[PDB]
From Swiss-Prot, chain F:
The gene is clpP. Fourteen ClpP subunits assemble into 2 heptameric rings which stack back to back to give a disk-like structure with a central cavity, resembling the structure of eukaryotic proteasomes. GO terms for biological process: protein quality control for misfolded or incompletely synthesized proteins. This is ATP-dependent Clp protease proteolytic subunit. InterPro entries: ClpP, ClpP/crotonase-like_dom_sf, ClpP/TepA, ClpP_Ser_AS. The lineage of its organism: Bacteria, Pseudomonadati, Pseudomonadota, Gammaproteobacteria, Legionellales.
Length: 192, 192, 186, 191, 187, 189, 193, 193, 185, 192
């Protein structure tokens, strides 16, 4: 018996050997689309699996995400600090605020992007409906999440939390060079 | 299916919807969910009655099982603005927004019937967006909340803290309990 | 100069309102409840001494709504005579029963039916309890009112309305919900 | 829905067509018999009785369907008001409408030559607990019995015979309907 | 005093034409409009039992069972009902056009008249299917009888022609007997 | 006595129409084109009836587009009568512009009124060239709003710009202090 | 995304696992998304399977659940105590009320979270619609489930039931440090030990 | 939500299994979710299969059902009594009336639940719409099914039919302890020391 | 040993190996044809051993049942029918059409027979054409039931006029089944 | 609906979807609308082919009638990033996003077929929100617009200003025109 090859899985997630799974064999994880719990947990599971196979080889996180929730990315971020392997981050195309958090939370020296990548950070978004008392409770928790995002970004970039809080107030786009300069990445894999 | 009434005017025969006819007796119906559209109609009715006679009482009949306090706010203010005393009678239901209006009637002129149901609770609200905006809207919600407590305290004779505690959750009052609470002044079994 | 119509602005119901007849038909719900109450107050305003005639044909709707109509009935000065033309389901039967002593009637193929209050809530446990308590109070109120107007014991009413309880016109006279049946108008 | 205008001492007064026909003590019972239109019809009879409790009321019927429970209220109203209620079936009298047609005053029930009369047993339904199902089932049996008693009363047939016929959709030509006792005669042209 | 409009949405255009004893039968013939047309004839008869009523028909479809009522109403009211097809008379409308008073059934030069058998349908138990199928056969028979009567054709001839959609030019319709004459311009 | 009386439309003489006789206009609900043109029409009619008597504009609006408010604002400066503004309940940003743009000394609110101001909102979708064209037009509308509030409140344009960057709620007292309104009425004067 | 596969090539041949089944091999179970009956049962099955394989090795329950019903979690909680293996619990990201219950219900000393995890507890939600009599019946049952939740939290945290009943009256967020202090977990892991 | 799988070392080689199919190998069947015809037939098929493998070893039915129709439960119940193996029943979480019927119908002495399980029984529900004659036909059938449920519960709990009928008139929740006392189950698998 | 195992072979495929076929859900064309194809496959594997049809069907059309029934009489193997839970009209036909002496239900099984349903919409001429066909099918149902139960066609027609529920015992008495199993015999 | 192929591996028979089989010949299909999901699938395929053999050419077969330029951007960077020369062939349509990848193939290795349609145009975008945020997204859209011009200029040899002018509106090119313009190098009728 040999496992069947597909480029893409059929609508049923047939247990066929898809292209992403073949890249997983080289320790490459793809983080794409909206960052939300479903895909997030699948990414966390791939890191745990990669760490189980070899806790000493780098894991490569390839990021192309135009959007999504920072609270979802949060679990992925913690997963990356938790597992033993260094996690290399490369932004292939887009890194929006959830995605940029992970890009930035890569191992020191091992965060990159490509020449036309688009990185962008902004403050957490939330929402609540209900009694005032509960609105106050959820509002405080959102303030907490917002502070955590600033602290995480401050830590990996080298910036002040006050500076990061200021920059993330509205959508803040960074060219690749600006992103190196900001400290969100270490270098651009320039055209060779 | 609103019924009409034809009156014989000095100038001739005139049709009235039932509510226009009762308006001729300075009765205003405040019914259904308290929301902006009906709030404004009730307010316009009060200003009309004030224009017809600045001195005769206005009678505001209340039967409202729900709705927003912010909507009730404009009506409450209109009540204090207009010159005529506003007598308030709860025919059936007066949930939070309704209870605000009922209680804000003219001293000694707030009433309900024997099976009326009165219920007060804290304000509800909600917002969705950036954390900064969530904070801004939470603060305004806190203020509207305090306003509701101040208004009930003022009209019932209770302390603000007492009112805050009682509205923390849905708080039902029998007619008797509502008199004792100071939300109304007396109950009418049959017309006085 | 006002237009004349059977239905729509001077409709058939407004014409009957001139004869102090009010129709209470369809599902008993807040909108039609308040309109009914308004006509009673209007009729009281015209003449607080002549009877008001409440014609009932309602196959359902919420007792909490009927509650306001009931209270209005006892509030206004005029005697309210009640006739069930076709159907009086539970909210409608409350109003049927709550008419003036001696002045509650039905037609021979009328259907009267009583049952306990319906309710519902969704949310936190604490709030469920708060709302369950209020439903029990509304439920006791329904029993008390039916008891008062029929002469039955509260417990007996409570037991009978536990489930849908249909009453023929004759059973309804016997029960105390109405005072008499009309074959043809006296 | 057309409007008719009439001259008064005090100006022009406008009427929809049915309000104008009401002026001739004609009431139209058409479409599905359900509560809304049933009550409107009862309201018209009460009004006409109020205007003159002694002149006939004319009920014109064209109803291809609807619920017997709704027809019940109209039927009782008809026996309740003092005026004779003459019934004419212009086109269709399906079960609920057939009830009303038959329940007109003796000697004053009619149809036109291509009218279609049809009678059937009551329909219903309930969803819930077994105990509740039995309660509603009994009430349904009762309403069904009432329908049979009403037809039996106005036709001269026995209830066992009415019950048998209404078991399934039972169509009658106008002649068969005279012979059945549902109507008294057919009008070829206005007599 | 009373307000004037062309269209409802209140004296309107149709109401004004009603004052000259003109009734419009337009759109799909179904119960609602059928009953309105019937009421209008009853009203016109009431105003004057002796003057003709004018039924202007422009109907591209609808159920014969609804038309049946109108037809019986036409023969029931005292006044002669003159019929004119301004545009279309599909089978239900054609039955009405054809059932106008002798000598008083007309159409315009580009009118389209079309007759066909009754349509129907039922769903349920076999016994009920059988029951409704017989009734449909009865109604289908009544349509043929009515058309034969007014056109002068044998019932069998009508039954054959109507077995499928049968279009008739104005001329063909005079010749067939559905109408008596064509008007180019108002005579 | 021909004309029938109703409290609510849906024609008849409704309660709003009766207040129009006393030169009172209600500006309620969302501020958008349809109601804006109705409000502008009422103003033209009132001016036509008497060019010199005040027009009273009662405002209770929780939101809406500034661009639609713009038209109402221009109408208010265009007609000859002084327009008195009173905020009965809510005056969100489109409403607040109208509230603040009433005649000098004749702008008011009630004690639990909520006034709130914020920068314009907008949006476009299409080719880059067109996005730039519409973005420039949004900037202009945004400037016009800062200019109008500056004019009527006495604040600097740069101060108004900063304050409206995000939703900015004012109590009636803060609103008097800001210059959006001239006074508060507890009860009618 | 779609669910990645792991193919282990072997001299024997080759075998294919989805990523979750591959981690099952290492006695790791994921409890993610809304806690509801469907995934609850899959999680219970997985615990029974692991017990079957070896009743003495720890089972690892990784939790990332931002919500869901406490009645659905109850079945998982009972399964955790029922199976022989100790169940270690780690909150990777979110544990709302139902998830918080399973987190706290892990074997003594083997309950953890990561530095930015969010733990949150609240009283049970419920709802019924129908006759008064039935509303009373379901309200009582809700009161019982609500007490049950309080008792379980009291049991595993060391807190008084009345204390827990007061804390869960409204949504109660805990930072990892507060969750340790409260007794819902035993320690926080910055990096895998 | 996605069913994990396992790979086992079989006689002709290694084969995959979904988790439920692997627990099938230990004679465990999961009855979860709403009881309705589709899952009912799967469960019966699983029982017939297990009987076919070994007619003499116990079958284990793990139940977590919050609702569903007694008429669907009927087929499962009868299949339980039909197949040769004793059918042990265990309520892991919830057993609403259709589930409770299957719980109670397990082999003598082999019916259980866990400490926070919820067992609930009520009379049958139904409904019909149509001609009166037909309504009468369907209400009698409903009465028969209603009597069958009472007779089945009575047999297995030892109660009187009249007592069962009275108790199920409305939703009747039992704690695990009451369920033991009632006769629905035989014992609770309490948390080991 | 290569092929994966699931409960949802799949479980029904594994039971197919023991010559068991499930007829469950609404009887309609899709599932009817799968049932038929399974009978043909079983016949092809072994034309002599019984086929076992387990029936649990609360509804469906008689015209789809018709095909299954003919298949049953067509294939060489005896078809044993067991009603595990429900067998409404369409299913009852199949239950009653099992091989003589090999038709069974369980103690709480619900069997129910009724006349054919149908309907048509169109021109009068076509309504008549389809009504007659409906009458033919209605007669075919009665003749099949009379053949297998032993009852007169007139008797079957009267009984099936409206929904006619039979207890297991009544169904043995009626001729629809041969015996009731308490436990596997 | 995707066909399978069974091959005789040295390790036994293996099933391939048609695309995975063509992957064995270093052929990748880029088809349909360009959007993130398919873009990431194509990038993974390039990463996988590089991993198999970093020196052999990758063959990118393009048939895309539309899609977002921002999505294409990730693919274009991937193409410059991986070590193998990427030969591009337009089988049918290359709309603006597709055209960007066609033109971005390796020097001398960009082609189309005789009835191919190539069309370029400026980026589309859009945003909804506060004015400040509108200006922010507008600047970013301008930047992406300039990037697209600079990439097309680089690969065609045209001046940026000329490209900017030409792409102002939909600009269709015949194969011959596309050779002349520098978007491709040659046209094949029959394979050479
Ligand atoms: Ca966010
Ligand atoms: Ca790490
Ligand atoms: Ca006042
Ligand atoms: Ca509120
Ligand atoms: Ca009274
Ligand atoms: Ca009926
Ligand atoms: Ca009479
Ligand atoms: Ca005539
Ligand atoms: Ca037809
Ligand atoms: Ca001729
Ligand atoms: Ca705006
Ligand atoms: Ca001015
Ligand atoms: Ca354990
Ligand atoms: Ca809960
Ligand atoms: Ca057994
Ligand atoms: Ca049930
Ligand atoms: Ca059938
Ligand atoms: Ca055979
Ligand atoms: Ca390259
Ligand atoms: Ca684009």
């Amino acid at each position: 018996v040999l496992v069947p090859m597909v480029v893409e899985q059929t609508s049923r997630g047939e247990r066929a050997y898809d292209i992403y799974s073949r890249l997983l064999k080289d320790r490459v994880i793809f983080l794409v689309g909206q960052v939300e719990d479903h895909m997030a947990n699948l990414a966390i599971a791939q890191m745990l699996f990669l760490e189980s196979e070899n806790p000493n080889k780098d894991i490569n996180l390839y990021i192309n995400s135009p959007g999504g929730a920072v609270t979802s990315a949060m679990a992925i971020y913690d997963t990356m600090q938790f597992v033993k392997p260094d996690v290399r981050t490369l932004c292939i195309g887009q890194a929006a605020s959830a995605g940029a958090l992970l890009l930035a939370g890569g191992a020191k020296g091992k965060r990159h992007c490509l020449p036309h990548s688009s990185v962008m950070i902004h403050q957490v978004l939330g929402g609540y409906q209900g009694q005032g008392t509960d609105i106050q409770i959820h509002a405080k928790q959102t303030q907490r999440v917002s502070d955590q995002l600033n602290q995480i970004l401050a830590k990996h970039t080298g910036k002040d939390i006050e500076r990061v809080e200021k920059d993330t107030n509205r959508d803040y786009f960074l060219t690749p060079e600006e992103a190196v300069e900001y400290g969100l990445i270490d270098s651009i894999f320039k055209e060779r």
